[PDB]
Design an enzyme around this catalytic site. Structure first.
Site, short mmCIF file in Angstrom:
data_model
loop_
_atom_site.label_atom_id
_atom_site.label_comp_id
_atom_site.label_asym_id
_atom_site.label_seq_id
_atom_site.Cartn_x
_atom_site.Cartn_y
_atom_site.Cartn_z
N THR A 30 0.86 -1.22 0.00
CA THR A 30 0.00 0.00 0.00
C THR A 30 0.88 1.24 0.00
O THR A 30 1.88 1.30 0.71
CB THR A 30 -0.96 0.01 1.22
OG1 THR A 30 -1.91 -1.05 1.07
CG2 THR A 30 -1.73 1.32 1.34
N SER A 31 0.50 2.22 -0.81
CA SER A 31 1.13 3.53 -0.82
C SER A 31 0.01 4.53 -0.74
O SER A 31 -0.86 4.56 -1.61
CB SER A 31 1.95 3.75 -2.09
OG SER A 31 2.81 2.65 -2.32
N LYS B 230 -8.96 2.71 -1.54
CA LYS B 230 -8.39 2.92 -0.20
C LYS B 230 -8.68 4.31 0.35
O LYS B 230 -8.35 4.60 1.51
CB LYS B 230 -6.88 2.68 -0.25
CG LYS B 230 -6.51 1.30 -0.77
CD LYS B 230 -5.01 1.10 -0.80
CE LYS B 230 -4.68 -0.25 -1.42
NZ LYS B 230 -3.25 -0.57 -1.22
N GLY C 129 4.81 0.92 0.79
CA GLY C 129 5.49 1.65 -0.28
C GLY C 129 5.98 3.06 0.04
O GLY C 129 6.71 3.64 -0.74
#
Ligand SMILES: *[C@@H](CS(C)(=O)=O)[C@H](Cc1ccc(CN)cc1)NC(=O)[C@@H](NC(=O)[C@H](CC(C)C)NC(=O)[C@@H](Cc1ccccc1)N=[N+]=[N-])[C@@H](C)O
Ligand SMILES: [Cl-]
Ligand SMILES: [Mg+2]
Ligand SMILES: [Mg+2]
Ligand SMILES: [Mg+2]
Ligand SMILES: [Mg+2]
Lengths: 196, 250, 244, 243, 241, 226, 231, 204
Positions: free
Chosen positions: A1-2, A33, A130
């Site tokens: 996840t970033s 997200k 990330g």
């Protein structure tokens, strides 16, 4: 996840990738997200999907009930409710949440809530697996009071690098712009951001 | 900020009467007439939609309620008390039966559970009895069609046909003359409409009458296809148009 | 506070009586008569229904005679809804005993348990007592055939023949007159029906008014059979004994 | 009859007589007032000097809730203290969860619902106080007055207790003569005058003036007591107006 | 005569405490009215500020329960606010558990069931209020549902509540007898508010200034209350035709 | 197990294989993994079979009572929210992995639910040990605005991929089609590609082959009576 | 009349009769006097005997090293309230290393008494208390009534015939407030004050009970031959 | 340590033409030690038959529990429970102990008295239902029984043929399991007669 949230002149922008992984399998390549707890208070979720969804659903409930009684809550108030859940249930949760919102009084605000349940008000915030790969990039390239187009480019370039290096991150770059004008959703596909 | 009423509000008087039950029955007597008739191939339950205002939408107020797909209920007395009993009756059909046996309860056992809830309001601390009498019509595989009355005391009795509320004494006499053991469902609906006309003052049509049947299985009303054993609900509420059609042949 | 509205259901009168128990017994005296008669080879339970209407579905109806297990039955006099609460408790106690000891519950033990529940409502809790009197008809391998009665006080006693409900004074005199210890089930059936026929407040005793049952150790090969009589069978036994 | 013997019983009128009897305890108490000003609120109260043995300035009646809300009340003083204690718990849990200090309207409903809850059951007695309270929040100044029934409204000026009619008449003049508004320092002076004028109803015993205030400019939006020179200036102004 | 003090049956089969709670309803001496348009539901209510010391902005008997649902109350304000807070809590809890906005009619039913409990359980008194819920429901369209101290509730084409409810009711009854439809055939909510005010003026026989009224409007996906200046604009349009 | 769901023009479709296993042994060759929640809401189950069955039945029961209470058709989001909150509460100990799909007044919907209480939204989804085989097919062939005929083909193909290539999955293909404005059609044994071939021999024994020590009649009836 | 059956019922004039009846139990109790200067605070209590064979009922209770009270009315209720004060004084020391302020002690007693006046089943406390103490703001004297009302005073008296002592203190106010750094003269003024409430009986050696707290004086009670000096 | 294989034992059930058969071994052991050669694992509640393998204390407990529940069912319903309904009752009762389960492998067998339809079903220890047309297996030699049944079985066998098939399935499966055997019982069930047969088998 970033995931990231960035304050700018007109307000705040939230940004995220769209990849959800179970180990090395990509369970969902088009995840959203960026999630809405109030009209102009949104959050970016990282950690356990079950936990962050369960929290976000409870916060949305609290802010809906706040609004019925006391009118529109501040972004600080939303962050406090997130914090209260995260901190008090720290032993049973794996949640890293960035809260971002627009008032007319306070303008754009960003609060980050890492694993412990601490709160940190910041000009911009980055989180998720990330994010480690872009601390250097984001620190060098962030300026205060950027325009909308500059902030979209800053987030797009940042998450492009996060996606490039992190296997856990990928897919489309979703963004949500929060200003006086309203709420705008943006999407950016691989063929656009990969060639940056 | 305490519930200190841990004692019975219904007690025996010197004569042996339970006052609050008798008074609840008096409330039922003041209530609008409802009736039930059992045929060979079905059961019919009916009542008047006594509209409190012409601005009120009487369609939204359902006096005849589905409890299970094969069981329906109607009342006379206090409408709010009925509404909460229907909520509890629907729930108890699941919790104390369907979640255990994987099927809906038979009419007599669902009635028994409703009766139990009403009995408890007649003996428990800090409560009054329910001010309703229910008529519960239903079907199940091993008992066939059946019709039950349930009173504020918790007592229940099976009927071939009966009536409760305002004009029940006159209506029960009317039903005694007309009822036989060879009635088809259409004949019972016809008799139900005739009986109910006597107790109604004003308008008498599909919009002022509420009528439902327990009859044949309705696979059209099921909502899905692909399971031969699930053949559809036997409970069906007649439409405003369907009532008016039968009032022309009256 | 709330004290103002409390009837105080569990207090003594100045004479040392329990008000609510006495008034519950007064309630029971208006209920339809139930008679139990115990013979050497079986027990009879006869009971009179209260609500004569031609439109009452009799064959599916049960207000008086209930089955507690395969060996034990009860006849009810009083509030039917109250009786059903107690009946379901008694049905559970029987199955708890069967689960624990792998033997059918002895009749007295079941009776004492129900009687103790009734007693509790007279001594604590501030609730009204159960307005019910039972006649228990049962069999076990210790005492054989047994008849008991319990009332709202929670007191229970054993009987050779007994009545509860309406006209018990008259009914008990008639049973005391014609009962004998060497009597048989067929004779007891006749006595039960004759007693109801005389004590009834109705004009005549008919099949549609009665609930009837027998417990016999006259099943195939020395077992015990509970027979709850169907309407047609009550009609036949009324013709046989010569009442209709 | 018998409808007035138990709390939460409707009379045939549709009234709760026990709540109306609590109002009599309020009417019996000393005079207390509230004045809404330009950027804040002023509270004042009459303290009857029963005896020379009472220590001056020690038996403080006005109470603070959180740091920004002032509360004053007339009637049964312990009932008022109980209500403020609850108010403090409500303000603490609000701040705990939502971070921001409790807004005044939000705080008003917290007291309102709690007082109303004491008219729902026969196992409790209604509150024997009318409470005048308020302060400064993000939306500006707010003054409220809360009755034994749970009823409350927002006010420009508020008054309760034995001298309420006298006070109400004086407050009504200020509203008419100052539509553009009253300053905080003016409201302190006027509050002193109104308590002195309302003292004609309790004229047997002499009294002690107590004033407090929240003002955005004068106190940074925090509740403070008026003390020393500013208190004496208000007493002098009040003494001059009665003569 | 303790059968008149708590919620138990009198010998006539009546609950006197429920009947007396209905009388408490009119203690405010305020009349409310609710009507339905094509796209909207309008609710109007009289506003009376007798005291000059009162802050008139805080004097209100209309409540925003959720974004979609509005509620006007006829009765004393403490009971009105008790009911308002509960309805807000129930609407929020519903959305959390079942994943969609609580419908107007379901909330009305829920509040009516709570009201029924106070008529059956002795320790709780009935609330002396009549609750009129309004929305534009996503399934049923414009909706008016009303609850009382008995626990009774029903849907309405239009409704009126207060001391002079019968006069308003008959006025509305007569209009719908002419038009032969279940609503005000009007596109904009502004004109439906004008209808509501006009028919209250005719029914009550009194003229209104901007401060004498209080208005609530339900549209698709929001319920809102009009300011004094929004009402003034409404009153100007009525007078000009 | 191979379960899948995908959306098409005016509806949603669910697919499932029919094999239940205990480690390496096949317990059931024709089990129904498409669970009923409401008339127009269905749930494909994977993971622990008792859990998936129990959790759908419980939520289905509560959905029915909710539908009666509100006088409305139940929504898929209600089933979703109730399932996830229940599963979240138990912290993954109820090992049910579900694909929920249905039609309601809002429209057609398709969700997935994981045992810990996380939910996803998708146009095509797959769960269970055959999810990768199915997802490979769905990723190769899924497009926007599929017809019903194309959707049934694609769904059954996705399930077949699991049947052939995954050892956990097998036997038949069950399908459920939920289209807007129409009754949901439940198609058990939609495909039957794994019928057992005829045996070489009949193993029916000569009578009296088995040695017997005792015989007796069992009394199953109530009361042998006089 | 009809509104005195319990504490939860207001009368039609807004009175709580059960609280007023509890107040009456104090007036039946034996006299006790409280007074203070800037340096010290004194309690003087007239103890009551059942008869000549009996002991004289103790009136003064120590709450901490810097605080204590005298009672008048139901002695068991004083024991409950003094025990509560002891605990609150003790909590302040253990948790905050802080001696409890006398004003704050009064606030705690007020709130504890109040809860018994608003709830059903309970009764009001049937006792009045005079709390003396020396804290960070010097000497203090409080008067507690079981209605909940607590009042900070220079001097006061409660119990039977207390109005005689209370008038004396009201005259003497300017004199006894100045008795600084002289405990014996402050006690003398308290003993002279309580003498104004006596009729028939006079102050004997086992009748009189005195207590004192001050600047460099812990709360100490004097009984028996220790008070013979002041007779 | 594994509760389902301390005591040992097996149950198998089969359908035939207008009939069902259910059979079980008679062994009860403490791992290697054989204790009892009379421990029957098939019970009946009216005309519905229940076989139970697994931990023996739970076999006994569940029998006592289902006797309790079917007795109360019969008193309230005024009829004997049917196989389809009983199957749901077993499932419900097992799943309510989801996180502290009974270590058992139940098998329902019977003929529906109204429709005349043969019915069999099996369950895991937490109540998942396996409703089979052909056969159900359970116990420590379940793998062995699956192999026997899958080859030996054919549909629509007459009662006296079905007896031979189920008996040979049980006996040969039991002989390949250390913890099963020590005798066996076979119930042949028809709509209104039930024959019970004890089989001669090797006693090791
Ligand atoms: C495939 C699931 S997979 C291999 O994980 O993708 C199927 C899904 C499924 C869903 C529902 C139904 C029927 N409603 C069938 C199938 N799941 C399985 O086959 C599961 N099998 C089981 O759960 C079996 C079922 C019995 C009936 C054979 N049970 C067991 O394997 C365990 C279960 C258990 C789990 C935890 C604690 C105790 C028991 N038991 N035993 N004994 C999947 C588990 O394989
Ligand atoms: Cl409800
Ligand atoms: Mg990547
Ligand atoms: Mg009540
Ligand atoms: Mg072997
Ligand atoms: Mg061996």
């Amino acid at each position: 996840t970033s995931i990231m949230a960035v304050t700018f002149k007109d307000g705040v922008i939230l940004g995220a990738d769209s990849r959800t992984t179970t180990g090395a399998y990509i369970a969902n390549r088009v995840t959203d997200k960026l999630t809405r707890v109030h009209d102009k208070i949104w959050c970016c979720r990282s950690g356990s999907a079950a936990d962050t969804q369960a929290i976000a659903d409870i916060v949305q409930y609290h802010l809906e009930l706040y609004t019925s009684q006391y009118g529109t809550p501040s972004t600080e108030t939303a962050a406090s409710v997130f914090k209260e859940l995260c901190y008090e249930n720290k032993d049973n949760l794996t949640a890293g949440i960035i809260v971002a919102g627009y008032d007319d009084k306070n303008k754009g605000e960003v609060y980050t809530i890492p694993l412990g349940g601490s709160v940190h008000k910041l000009p911009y915030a980055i989180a998720g697996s990330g994010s480690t790969f872009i601390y250097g990039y984001c620190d060098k390239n962030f300026r205060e009071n950027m325009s909308k187009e500059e902030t979209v480019d800053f987030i797009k370039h940042s998450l492009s690098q996060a996606i490039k290096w992190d296997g856990s991150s990928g897919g489309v770059i979703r963004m949500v712009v929060l200003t006086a004008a309203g709420v705008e959703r943006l999407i950016f596909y691989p063929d656009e951001y990969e060639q940056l | 900020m305490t519930d200190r009423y841990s004692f019975s509000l219904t007690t025996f008087s010197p004569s042996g009467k339970l006052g609050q039950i008798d008074y609840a029955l008096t409330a039922v007597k003041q209530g609008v007439t409802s009736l039930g008739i059992k045929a060979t191939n079905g059961v019919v339950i009916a009542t008047e939609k006594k509209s409190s205002s012409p601005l009120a939408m009487s369609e939204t107020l359902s006096k005849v309620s589905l409890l299970t797909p094969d069981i329906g209920a109607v009342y006379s007395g206090m409408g709010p008390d009925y509404r909460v009993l229907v909520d509890k009756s629907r729930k108890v059909a699941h919790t104390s039966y369907k979640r255990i046996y994987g099927e809906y309860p038979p009419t007599k056992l669902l009635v028994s559970e409703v009766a139990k809830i009403m009995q408890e309001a007649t003996q428990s601390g800090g409560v009054r009895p329910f001010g309703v009498s229910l008529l519960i019509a239903g079907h199940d595989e091993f008992n066939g069609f059946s019709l039950y009355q349930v009173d504020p005391s918790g007592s229940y009795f099976p009927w071939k046909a009966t009536a409760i509320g305002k004009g029940s004494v006159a209506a029960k006499t009317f039903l005694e003359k007309r009822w036989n053991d060879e009635l088809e469902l259409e004949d019972a609906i016809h008799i139900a409409l005739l009986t109910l006309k006597e107790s109604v003052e004003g308008e008498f049509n599909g919009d002022t009458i509420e009528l439902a049947i327990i009859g044949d299985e309705n696979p059209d009303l099921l909502g899905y296809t692909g399971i031969p054993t699930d053949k559809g609900p036997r409970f069906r509420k007649l439409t405003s148009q369907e009532i008016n059609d039968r009032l022309e042949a009256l | 506070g709330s004290r103002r509205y409390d009837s105080r259901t569990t207090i003594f009168s100045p004479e040392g009586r329990l008000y609510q128990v006495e008034y519950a017994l007064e309630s029971i005296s208006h209920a339809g008569t139930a008679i139990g008669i115990m013979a050497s080879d079986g027990i009879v339970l006869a009971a009179e229904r209260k609500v004569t209407s031609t439109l009452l579905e009799q064959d599916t109806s049960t207000e008086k005679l209930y089955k507690l297990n395969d060996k034990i039955a009860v006849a009810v006099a009083g509030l039917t809804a109250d009786a059903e609460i107690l009946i379901n408790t008694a049905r559970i106690h029987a199955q708890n005993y069967l689960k624990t000891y792998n033997e059918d519950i002895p009749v007295e033990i079941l009776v004492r348990r129900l009687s103790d529940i009734k007693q509790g409502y007279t001594q604590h809790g501030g609730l009204r007592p159960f307005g019910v009197s039972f006649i228990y008809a049962g069999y076990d391998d210790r005492y054989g055939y047994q008849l008991y009665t319990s009332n709202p006080s929670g007191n229970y006693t054993g009987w050779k023949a007994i009545s509860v409900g309406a006209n018990t004074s008259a009914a008990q005199t008639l049973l005391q007159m014609d009962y004998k210890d060497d009597m048989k089930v067929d004779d007891a059936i006749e006595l039960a029906l004759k007693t109801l026929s005389k004590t009834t407040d109705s004009s005549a005793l008919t099949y549609d008014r009665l609930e009837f049952a027998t417990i016999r150790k006259g099943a195939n090969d020395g077992e015990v059979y509970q027979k709850i009589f169907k309407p047609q069978e009550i009609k036949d036994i009324l013709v046989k004994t010569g009442i209709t | 009859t018998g409808y007035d013997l138990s709390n939460s019983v409707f009379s045939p009128d549709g009234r709760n007589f026990q709540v109306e009897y609590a109002v009599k305890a309020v009417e019996n108490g000393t005079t207390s007032i509230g004045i809404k000003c330009n950027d804040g609120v002023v509270f004042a109260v009459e303290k009857l000097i029963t005896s020379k043995l009472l220590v001056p300035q020690k038996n403080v009646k006005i109470q603070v809730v959180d740091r920004h809300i002032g509360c004053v009340y007339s009637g049964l003083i312990p009932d008022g203290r109980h209500l403020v204690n609850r108010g403090r718990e409500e303000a603490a849990s609000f701040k705990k969860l939502y971070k921001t200090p409790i807004p005044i309207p939000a705080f008003a409903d917290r007291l309102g619902q709690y007082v109303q809850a004491h008219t729902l059951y026969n196992s409790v007695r209604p509150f024997g106080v009318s409470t005048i309270f308020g302060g400064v929040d993000k939306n500006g100044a707010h003054l409220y007055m809360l009755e034994p029934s749970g009823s409350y409204w927002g006010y420009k000026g508020a008054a309760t207790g034995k001298g309420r009619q006298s006070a109400k008449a004086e407050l009504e003049k200020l509203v008419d003569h100052h539509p553009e508004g009253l300053s905080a320092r003016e409201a302190v002076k006027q509050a002193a005058k109104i308590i002195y004028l309302a003292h004609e109803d309790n004229k047997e015993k002499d009294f002690e003036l107590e004033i407090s205030w929240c003002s955005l400019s004068e106190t940074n939006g925090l509740h403070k007591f008026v003390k020393g020179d500013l208190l004496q200036e208000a007493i002098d102004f009040a003494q001059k107006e009665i003569n | 005569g303790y059968d008149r003090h708590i919620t138990i049956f009198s010998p006539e089969g009546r609950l006197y405490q429920v009947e007396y709670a209905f009388k408490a309803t009119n203690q405010t001496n305020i009349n409310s009215l609710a009507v339905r348009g094509k796209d909207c539901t309008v609710v109007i209510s009289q506003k009376k500020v007798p005291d000059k010391l009162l802050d008139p902005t805080t004097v209100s008997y209309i409540f925003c329960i959720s974004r979609t649902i509005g509620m006007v109350v006829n009765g004393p304000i403490p009971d009105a606010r008790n009911a308002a807070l509960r309805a807000k809590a129930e609407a929020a809890e519903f959305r959390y558990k079942y994943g969609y906005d609580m419908p107007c009619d379901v909330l009305a039913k829920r509040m009516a069931n709570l009201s029924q409990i106070y008529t059956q359980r002795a320790y709780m008194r009935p609330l002396g209020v009549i609750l009129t819920f309004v929305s534009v429901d996503e399934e049923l369209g414009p909706s008016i549902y009303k609850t009382d101290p008995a626990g009774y509730y029903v849907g309405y084409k239009a409704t009126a509540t207060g001391p002079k409810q019968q006069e308003i009711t008959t006025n509305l009854e007569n209009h719908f007898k002419k038009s032969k439809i279940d609503h005000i055939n009007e596109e904009s909510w502004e004109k439906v508010v004008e209808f509501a005010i006009t028919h209250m003026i005719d029914a009550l026989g009194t003229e209104f200034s901007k401060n004498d009224l209080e208005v609530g409007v339900a549209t698709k996906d929001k319920f809102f209350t009009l300011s004094a200046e929004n009402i003034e604009e409404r009153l100007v349009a009525i007078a000009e035709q | 197990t191979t379960i899948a769901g995908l959306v098409f023009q005016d509806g949603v479709i669910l697919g499932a294989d029919t094999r239940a296993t205990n480690d390496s042994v096949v317990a059931d060759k024709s089990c129904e993994k498409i669970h009923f929640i409401a008339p127009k809401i269905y749930c494909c189950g994977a993971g622990v079979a008792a859990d998936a069955e129990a959790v759908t039945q419980l939520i289905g029961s509560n959905i029915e009572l909710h539908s009666l209470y509100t006088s409305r058709e139940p929504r898929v989001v209600s089933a979703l929210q109730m399932l996830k909150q229940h599963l979240f509460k138990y912290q993954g100990h109820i090992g049910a992995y579900l694909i929920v799909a249905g039609v309601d007044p809002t429209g057609s919907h398709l969700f997935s639910i994981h045992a810990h209480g996380s939910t996803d939204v998708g146009y095509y989804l797959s769960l269970g040990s055959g999810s990768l085989a199915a997802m490979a097919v769905l990723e190769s062939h899924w497009k926007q605005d599929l017809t019903k005929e194309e959707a049934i083909k694609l769904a059954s193909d996705a399930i077949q991929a699991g049947i052939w290539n995954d050892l956990g999955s097998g036997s038949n293909v069950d399908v459920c089609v939920m289209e807007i404005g129409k009754d949901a059609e439940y198609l058990r044994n939609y495909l039957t590609p794994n019928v057992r071939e005829e045996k070489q021999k009949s193993y029916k024994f000569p009578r009296g082959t088995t040695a017997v020590l005792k015989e007796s009649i069992v009394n199953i009836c109530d009361i042998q009576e006089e | 009349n009809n509104y005195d059956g319990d504490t939860v019922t207001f009368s039609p004039t807004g009175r709580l009769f059960q609280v007023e009846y509890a107040l009456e139990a104090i007036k039946q109790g034996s006299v006790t006097v409280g007074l203070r200067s800037n340096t010290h605070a004194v309690l003087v209590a007239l103890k009551r005997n059942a008869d000549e064979l009996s002991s004289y009922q103790k009136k003064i209770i120590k709450c901490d090293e810097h605080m204590g009270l005298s009672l008048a009315g139901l002695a068991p209720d004083a024991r409950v309230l003094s025990n509560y004060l002891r605990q609150q004084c003790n909590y302040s020391s253990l948790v905050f290393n802080r001696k409890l302020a006398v004003e704050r002690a009064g606030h705690l007693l007020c709130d504890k008494a109040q809860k018994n006046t608003q709830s059903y089943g309970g009764r009001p406390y049937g006792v009045g208390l005079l709390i003396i103490g020396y804290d960070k703001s010097g000497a203090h004297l409080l008067e507690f009534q079981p209605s909940g009302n607590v009042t900070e005073l220079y001097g006061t008296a409660i119990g039977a015939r207390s109005q005689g002592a209370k008038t004396y203190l009201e005259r003497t106010l300017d004199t006894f407030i100045k008795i600084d750094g002289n405990p014996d003269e402050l006690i003398k003024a308290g003993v002279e004050a309580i003498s104004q409430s006596l009729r028939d009986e006079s102050l004997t050696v086992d009748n009189l009970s005195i207590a004192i707290v001050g600047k460099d004086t812990p709360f100490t009670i004097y009984d028996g031959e220790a008070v013979a000096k002041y007779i | 340590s594994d509760p389902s294989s301390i005591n040992g034992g097996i149950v198998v059930a089969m359908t035939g033409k207008d009939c069902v058969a259910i059979a079980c071994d008679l062994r009860l052991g403490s791992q290697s030690l054989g204790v009892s050669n009379k421990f029957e694992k098939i019970f009946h509640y009216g005309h519905v038959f229940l076989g139970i393998t697994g931990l023996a204390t739970d076999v006994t407990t569940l029998n006592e529990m289902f006797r309790y529940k079917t007795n109360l069912y019969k008193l309230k319903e005024e009829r004997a429970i049917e196989p389809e309904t009983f199957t749901q009752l077993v499932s419900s009762s097992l799943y309510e102990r989801r996180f502290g389960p009974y270590f058992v492998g139940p098998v329902v067998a019977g003929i529906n008295s109204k429709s005349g339809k043969p019915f069999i079903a099996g369950f895991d220890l937490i109540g998942c239902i396996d409703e089979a047309k052909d056969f159900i297996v359970s116990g420590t030699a379940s793998d062995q029984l699956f192999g026997m049944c899958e080859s030996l079985y054919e549909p629509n066998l007459e009662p006296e043929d079905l007896f031979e098939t189920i008996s040979q399935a049980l006996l040969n499966a039991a002989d390949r399991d250390a913890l099963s055997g020590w005798g066996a019982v076979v119930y042949i069930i028809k709509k209104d007669e039930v024959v019970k047969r004890y089989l001669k088998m090797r006693q090791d």
